[PDB]
Amino acid sequence: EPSDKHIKEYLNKIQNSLSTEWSPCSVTCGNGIQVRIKPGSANKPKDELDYANDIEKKICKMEKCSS
Amino acid sequence: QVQLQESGGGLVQAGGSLRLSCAASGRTFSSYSMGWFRQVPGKEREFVARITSSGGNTDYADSAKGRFTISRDNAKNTVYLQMSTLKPEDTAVYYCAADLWQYGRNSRAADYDYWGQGTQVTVSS
């Protein structure tokens, strides 16, 4: 699984893009995360978003990484 | 990774005030959102306050709103918890925690990444 670290660093990168639309996969190969704002929370200011309740996350599986 | 060490806990009379400190190793302190939790026997840590890495915005549990103030000094690599109007029910071990998510709100112990050793606050009536 994508680690908590990975997920949070991705959230830090795309904070200003974060919306109710699912983000791209955070990785181009291997397993990563997609994130979005829970639609019922579209109204909240972005610095009021609760990590567990307003940020939805799911694993996205891409092609294997080269070695 | 960073290492956290809390201090400032002790014995305080009810109605009193107390300031706890939590210092971090390394030079990446400022990239972490910092939280304070507290723990009583038989129960898991409960959220007290949070201060984000990006913009120093703050958030408070219901038990702490109006009474407590969380602040940080990144030059000193320290986050602070200023508590006032202390009651016996506030007796607990107080923990600081670091969270790599730099924005927003976060009140679950499971969703923080690094933990201090805790400092005991005893409030007598």
CATH of the domain at A36: 2.20.100.10
Q: Is residue A12 within 8 Å of residue B28, measured between CB atoms?
A: no
Nearest-angstrom CA–CA distance, B52 and B87: 27
Which residues in chain A touch residue B100, judged by CB atoms under 8 angstroms apart? 4-5, 8-9, 12
Nearest-angstrom CA–CA distance, A55 and A4: 13
Nearest-angstrom CA–CA distance, B22 and B67: 19
Rg (CA), chain A: 12
- Is A33 a domain residue? yes
Domain spans in chain B, listed from the N-terminal domain onward: 4-124
3-state SS, residue B62: coil
The experimental technique used to determine this model is X-ray
Q: Would the CB atoms of B105 and A5 count as touching at under 8 Å?
A: no
> In the structure encoding, which two tokens stand for residue B85, read together?
């109007």
Which residues in chain B touch residue A15, judged by CB atoms under 8 angstroms apart? 54, 102-103
**Parallel, antiparallel or unpaired: strands B119-124 and B11-13:** parallel
Distance (Å) from the C-alpha of residue A10 to the closest C-alpha of chain B? 9
Angle at B101 between CA B83 and CA A4, to 5 degrees: 120
3-state SS, residue B43: coil
3-state SS, residue A4: helix
| Single-letter residue type at B18 | L
CA pseudo-torsion sign B65, B1, B121, B37? positive
Q: Give the resolution in Å.
A: 2.1
- Is A67 a domain residue? no
Output the 3-class SS for B89-109: HHCEEEEEEEECCCCCECCCH
CB atoms within 10 A of CB B42: 5
CATH code, B4-124 = 2.60.40.10
Residue in B54, B55, B106 closest to A51 by CB: B106
Residue A62's alpha-carbon distances to A32, A52, B63, in angstroms, are 8, 25, 45
- Is A45 a domain residue? yes
The count of structural domains within chain A is 1
